[PDB]
Amino acid sequence: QTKHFTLKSDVLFNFNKSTLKPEGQQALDQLYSQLSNLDPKDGSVVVLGFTDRIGSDAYNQGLSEKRAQSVVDYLISKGIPSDKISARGMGESNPVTGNTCDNVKPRAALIDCLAPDRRVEIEVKGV
Amino acid sequence: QTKHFTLKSDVLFNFNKSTLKPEGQQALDQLYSQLSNLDPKDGSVVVLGFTDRIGSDAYNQGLSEKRAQSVVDYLISKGIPSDKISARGMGESNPVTGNTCDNVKPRAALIDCLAPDRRVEIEVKGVK
Numbered sequence A: 001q002t003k004h005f006t007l008k009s010d011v012l013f014n015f016n017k018s019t020l021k022p023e024g025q026q027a028l029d030q031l032y033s034q035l036s037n038l039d040p041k042d043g044s045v046v047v048l049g050f051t052d053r054i055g056s057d058a059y060n061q062g063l064s065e066k067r068a069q070s071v072v073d074y075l076i077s078k079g080i081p082s083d084k085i086s087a088r089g090m091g092e093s094n095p096v097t098g099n100t101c102d103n104v105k106p107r108a109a110l111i112d113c114l115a116p117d118r119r120v121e122i123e124v125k126g127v
Numbered sequence B: 001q002t003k004h005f006t007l008k009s010d011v012l013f014n015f016n017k018s019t020l021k022p023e024g025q026q027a028l029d030q031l032y033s034q035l036s037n038l039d040p041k042d043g044s045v046v047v048l049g050f051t052d053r054i055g056s057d058a059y060n061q062g063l064s065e066k067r068a069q070s071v072v073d074y075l076i077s078k079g080i081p082s083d084k085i086s087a088r089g090m091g092e093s094n095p096v097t098g099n100t101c102d103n104v105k106p107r108a109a110l111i112d113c114l115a116p117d118r119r120v121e122i123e124v125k126g127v128k
Helices: A022-032 A063-078 A107-117 B022-035 B057-078 B107-117
Strands: A002-008 A044-050 A085-091 A119-125 B003-008 B044-050 B085-089 B119-125
Touching (some): A002 A022, A044 A063, B003 B022, B044 B057
Parallel strands (some): A044 A085, B044 B085
Antiparallel strands (some): A002 A119, A044 A119
16 A cells, blocks of 8 residues: 655745754654554655745755655654655656746746645655 | 936846846847947946845855846847946845845745845946
8 A cells, every 4th residue: 555645845844944844843743653654574655855947945956855855854753764764856857736837927926836846745655 | 427227136037047038138128228328438337236135145146146247248249348337246235125024924925025125236327
C-alpha cells in the first residue's frame, strides 16, 4: 500500500527560509501516524520540495531541496529511521497549476494563483 | 531644465530577474522622445534602480544595479550616447512607502503594498 501527502510551503516555511514554522511542525505531527506505519524491511519515504514557475517564495537557490531536507530532519526526530527516508528538490518541475496562471501579471495576484505549486509532497511506499 | 520619470519595476522585469521584458522595452519606447531630446553640452541621463525592503540589503543592491544597467543598455541602443547616460543601483533605500507596509501579511498582500518601492527612476538633465 502506497500513500501520498501534500503540504503547503506557505504554511511550512517563511519566505526564503527552510526552518519549519510551528504550524508546519504540527502538520507533520498530524500526519506522522500514517506517515510512519512502514514495513520495517521495504518501507521508504521520499520528501519532494517544489516551488512555482517564478520561484516566488525564494531569492536564494537550493531552497526546494533545503525545505525537503528540513522535513526529512523533522520526521527523523519523530522516529522515522534515517536510512528509510530521503529528500529531493524538484524546483519548478511538475507544476500543479498547468497553464492556469499564464495570463496573470501583477506580482501579488500571480503569487496567489501559483500557491498550489508551492508545496512539499511526501511519498510513502509500503504501509 | 530637469525631468523625472518613474517606471514600474514589475512591468520591466520578471520576479527576481534583471532581463528587461518586452513590455519594459515598450514602456521605454514611449518615454523615449521625452528623454532623448538632450543638450549636447549639459544634457545627461541617470537611471536609478530601487527594490522593496524584502530580503538581503546586499542582494537587493546587486539586483538593483543589474536592472538599472539593463535599462541603460537598452536606452543606449535606442540612440542615447553612452557617455551621457549612467546607471546607479540603489537597493532598498529611499522607499516610497515608508512604514506603510511594516505590519502587512501575508506575503502576497505585502508584495502588493510594497509595489511603489519597486521602481526605476530616470533623471533627465538639460532637455531642449
